């Protein structure tokens, strides 16, 4: 690999707890002497933040990669500027666009380039005796850059470049984020005096800039300044004595705060809205003081743990190929009916073997057909011209739709249309495909009209003469390969079904599992859904019934499709959560009553 | 009793139960039916409270 480092005393990650730390201004507006209740991403109060060290002490030096969830509260503490830069990106492969922020003697550079980083990047400085300064020794953080859709350079400056030791006289906090493409940052500086673990108090963080970059970030890194000197062995693998360094890394969550803007518009205090009941009552009352009494707060609910699935023991496959172009279909006027049941089905056959151009459903999303359980699926077979493929729809018009085959408005099913030109392109033309041109009155949904008599347009009763005003509504087609694409035949199949009427065994490939009792768990019984506790009751179902119902017209009891027992359903737990307090002025201990 | 019995009316949706709506159909095309149900139940609650 690239250059590496040795003498890394691996230790478990030290832990410490923040104390009302890492609260920033949610937005740009200004308020005076109010108590706003914002809802954004914040570091939880009294959370658990992972310590990290780079101080050699000994033989301690660590700055590995860390995951980057929706925000990081990077709070370093430095005295001689040992931690300088940052790395962002997705995999740091120099193939997915990545960000970089270096604090060089020239500028605080920001780059968006496909940089190729080694496994141990850093910033190198040496204490030359001829000139007691700190110059860069090996700036080989990256290999090169191919495409860079965004670059920026800030103003020039000159760092103090300290090479001394001592307690961290200052403090630095940063909250990196990423929303709607945009990349943000926050900062705040305070010359706090301490030697050890992060101090007490509460302070706010101010916005700095908003980068309009569009990369996706998952995992990040950190630069260090190696304090190379003559006492070091003198190599990129073992010559280094860095010195004091310390920085923590927190993670954000979708919490809810209640900030208290003071008169000047600054933030002086904040209360977490879910840490303990007293804070919840403060959040509810929109005040920092709670008067003696009993208050109301959020509700209590038991959360389900396990999910169970039950399905009847069915193994026979559903014959679909013998319906999809087996040998031949029928004409429009005399369409083909077929009832399929008592088999396990699937939809993937409608997505892999032949991606039919026209595939649009109604009432049911096409991708959800696995779980919901069907009942007596119906199929239709016929072929129409490509001009009027839209005629088959719930609420459209047209000659064949209103005269040969009409859909009900409440039709619940999918429709599939796909050309078969090679099968139906005869140079002489196949003319068994017909239509009903005329009819005195419209028809009924899913009703056949096999009448092929001589239609009488007007007067002169026909009596089998086919004279004037006696025409034959049954007319053939002109399907030849020379015809246009619009007139080319389309093969149309209508998938019709109804659900939730009776115990059926037609639905999909889901699999069963064991049955549990006396626990608030989810369930799925032949496509049913809900949540509750399943006990054993004493109801005597008649040997044709399936469900049970209350006076509220809901599901009370069900029947196991396999064991044929009778189970019960009961909601898990309701109830509010009151809070008993003597008063924030008096004390800060509360008693909680679950109703 | 009337407030309970109001919990079984479609108000215009294809079914009167929310779980069936969210299981059989894709949410971006189910938000309208959810809105219908929410409007009906809000009306019932306002009547009862007044």
């Amino acid at each position: 690999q690239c250059v590496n480092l040795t003498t890394r005393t691996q230790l478990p990650p030290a832990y410490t707890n923040s104390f009302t730390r890492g609260v920033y201004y949610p937005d740009k507006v200004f308020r005076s002497s109010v108590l706003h209740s914002t809802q954004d991403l914040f570091l939880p109060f009294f959370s658990n933040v992972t310590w990290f060290h780079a101080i050699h002490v000994t033989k301690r030096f660590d700055n590995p990669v860390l995951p980057f969830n929706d925000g990081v509260y990077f709070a370093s503490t430095e005295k001689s500027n040992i931690i300088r830069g940052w790395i962002f990106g997705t995999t740091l492969d120099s193939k997915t666009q990545s960000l970089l922020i270096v604090n060089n003697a020239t500028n605080v550079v920001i780059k968006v380039c496909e940089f190729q980083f080694c496994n141990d990047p850093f910033l190198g400085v040496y204490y030359h005796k001829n000139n007691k300064s700190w110059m860069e020794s090996e700036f080989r953080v990256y290999s090169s850059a191919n495409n860079c859709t965004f670059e920026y350079v800030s103003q020039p400056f000159l760092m103090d470049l300290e090479g001394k030791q001592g307690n961290f006289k200052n403090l630095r906090e940063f909250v990196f984020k990423n929303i709607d493409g945009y990349f943000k940052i926050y900062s705040k500086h305070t010359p706090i005096n301490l030697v050890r673990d992060l101090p007490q108090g509460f302070s706010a963080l101010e916005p700095l800039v908003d980068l309009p970059i569009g990369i996706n970030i998952t995992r990040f890194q950190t630069l260090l300044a190696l304090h190379r000197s003559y006492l070091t062995p003198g190599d990129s693998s073992s010559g280094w004595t860095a010195g004091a360094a310390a920085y923590y890394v927190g993670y954000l969550q979708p919490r809810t705060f209640l900030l208290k803007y003071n008169e000047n518009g600054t933030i002086t205090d904040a209360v977490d809205c879910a840490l303990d009941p007293l804070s919840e009552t403060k959040c509810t009352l929109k005040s920092f003081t709670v008067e003696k009494g009993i208050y109301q707060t959020s509700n209590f609910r038991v959360q389900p743990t396990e999910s169970i699935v039950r399905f009847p023991n069915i193994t026979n496959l559903c014959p679909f190929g013998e319906v999809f172009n087996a040998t031949r279909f029928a004409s429009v006027y005399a369409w083909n009916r077929k009832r399929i049941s008592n088999c396990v089905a699937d939809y993937s056959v409608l997505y892999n073997s032949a991606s039919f151009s026209t595939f649009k459903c109604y009432g049911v999303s096409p991708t959800k057909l696995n779980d919901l359980c069907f009942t007596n699926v119906y199929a239709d077979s016929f072929v129409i011209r490509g001009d009027e493929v839209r005629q088959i729809a719930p609420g459209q018009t047209g000659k064949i739709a209103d005269y040969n085959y009409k859909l009900p408005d409440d039709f619940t099913g999918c429709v599939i249309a796909w050309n078969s030109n090679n099968l139906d392109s005869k140079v002489g033309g196949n003319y068994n495909y017909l239509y009903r041109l005329f009819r005195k009155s419209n028809l009924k949904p899913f009703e056949r009209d096999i009448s092929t008599e001589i239609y009488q347009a007007g007067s002169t009763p026909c009596n089998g003469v086919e004279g004037f005003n006696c025409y034959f509504p049954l007319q053939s087609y002109g399907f030849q390969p020379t015809n246009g694409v619009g007139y080319q035949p389309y093969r149309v199949v209508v998938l019709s079904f109804e659900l939730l009427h009776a115990p059926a065994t037609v639905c999909g490939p889901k699999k069963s599992t064991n049955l549990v009792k006396n626990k608030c768990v989810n369930f799925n019984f032949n496509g049913l859904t809900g949540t509750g506790v399943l006990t054993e009751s004493n109801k005597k179902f008649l040997p044709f019934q399936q469900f049970g119902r209350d006076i509220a017209d809901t599901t009370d009891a069900v029947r196991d499709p396999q064991t044929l027992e009778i189970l019960d359903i009961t909601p898990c737990s309701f109830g509010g959560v009151s809070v008993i307090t003597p008063g924030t002025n008096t004390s800060n201990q509360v008693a909680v009553l679950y109703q | 009793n009337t407030l309970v019995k109001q919990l079984s009316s479609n108000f215009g949706a294809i079914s009167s139960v929310l779980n069936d709506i969210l299981s059989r159909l894709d949410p971006p095309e189910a938000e309208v039916q959810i809105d219908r149900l929410i409007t009906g139940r809000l009306q019932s609650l306002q009547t009862y409270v007044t």
Partner: peptide
């Protein structure tokens, strides 16, 4: 069991789940 009188007892014996807590 309680300290109710006789007429109070006579009056007592003559008079007769979605979030609906009581």
């Amino acid at each position: 069991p309680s300290k109710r009188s006789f007429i109070e007892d006579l009056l007592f014996n003559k008079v007769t789940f979605n979030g609906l807590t009581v």
